[PDB]
């Protein structure tokens with residue numbers, strides 16, 4: 001299934017770690033390792049979703065000036081990915097909030113996105129993710145923030161790049177149709193929107209346990225979203241998923257991917273949660289060559305790599 005999915009890869013986390021803002025590099029946070037990214041590219045990945053924290057990039061206000069050193073470090077990783085011939089999805093890993101408050105100014109968010117898209121507008125292998133996992137916020141506001149981002153990105157002259165939109169309820173696939181129906185209203189002049197949903201396989205869907213509910217839970221939790229995408233003539237992507245390195249989860253992951261792979265009219269691929277250099281013994285670490293999921297799950301992913 002080499003050419004079944006358009007994009008298949010991994011999240012690259014570390015720059016959003018910690019609670020200290022701005023914090024300090026090497027203590028509170030770290031950027032992804034280009035070597036470890038190279039190794040995943042060598043295994044066949046062609047997509048990396050790169051996390052960063054808005055308040056580190058923009059320490060004063062969201063329409064204010066950059067921390068140019070944090071930005072340069074982000075750009076180094078983006079260039080490693082795209083020089084590698086992979087797509088780099090830029091992920092402000094911010095939960096629809098900035099300095100702990102919901103982003104209620106769609107004007108300010110559109111400007112944030114005009115400015116950031118301006119940094120990458122010439123790089124056709126960059127993609128833009130509006131914000132990670134909106135939750136516990138007004139649904140009209142979520143729609144209008146996603147539209148503000150699209151408006152800002154295109155206003156900047158970033159016209160080649162795909163734009164990954166995220167919904168409420170932590171953009172979960174299993175709750176999509178229940179809460180995010182309004183998101184079908186989003187418009188892009190370039191018609192390059194991708195609906196990004198996230199899915200975990202544990203009992204409460206929080207991704208905090210290594211146990212999966214059952215062998216079919218992954219397929220189960222993306223079925224209603226698949227039909228929504230079909231009915232509304234949209235395309236989607238699973239931007240974060242994981243399972244523990246055990247047999248029931250290996251089945252549930254394989255079954256979710258197999259079902260998506262029979263529905264590529266709507267599914268454009270997936271990105272595992274997560275790689276990056278500071279995960280240690282994390283149950284879902286894809287960081288090569290010793291992460292738990294790298295050694296325990298990569299053989300299920302290899303069909304698509």
Ligand SMILES: *[C@@H]1O[C@H](CO)[C@@H](O)[C@H](O)[C@H]1NC(C)=O
Pocket residue numbers: 025069070073
């Ligand atoms: C940028 O990364 C270099 C290491 O390559 C490091 O010395 C520096 O502290 C980082 N600065 C940040 C993230 O603001």
Ligand SMILES: *[C@@H]1O[C@H](CO)[C@@H](O)[C@H](O)[C@H]1NC(C)=O
Pocket residue numbers: 262
């Ligand atoms: C795969 O997709 C085709 C329609 O494209 C359908 O005929 C077939 O039943 C699907 N397979 C499964 C296992 O649902």
Ligand SMILES: [Ca+2]
Pocket residue numbers: none
């Ligand atoms: Ca069927």
Ligand SMILES: [Ca+2]
Pocket residue numbers: 002043044304305
């Ligand atoms: Ca291959």
Ligand SMILES: [Ca+2]
Pocket residue numbers: 044302303304305
């Ligand atoms: Ca393969």
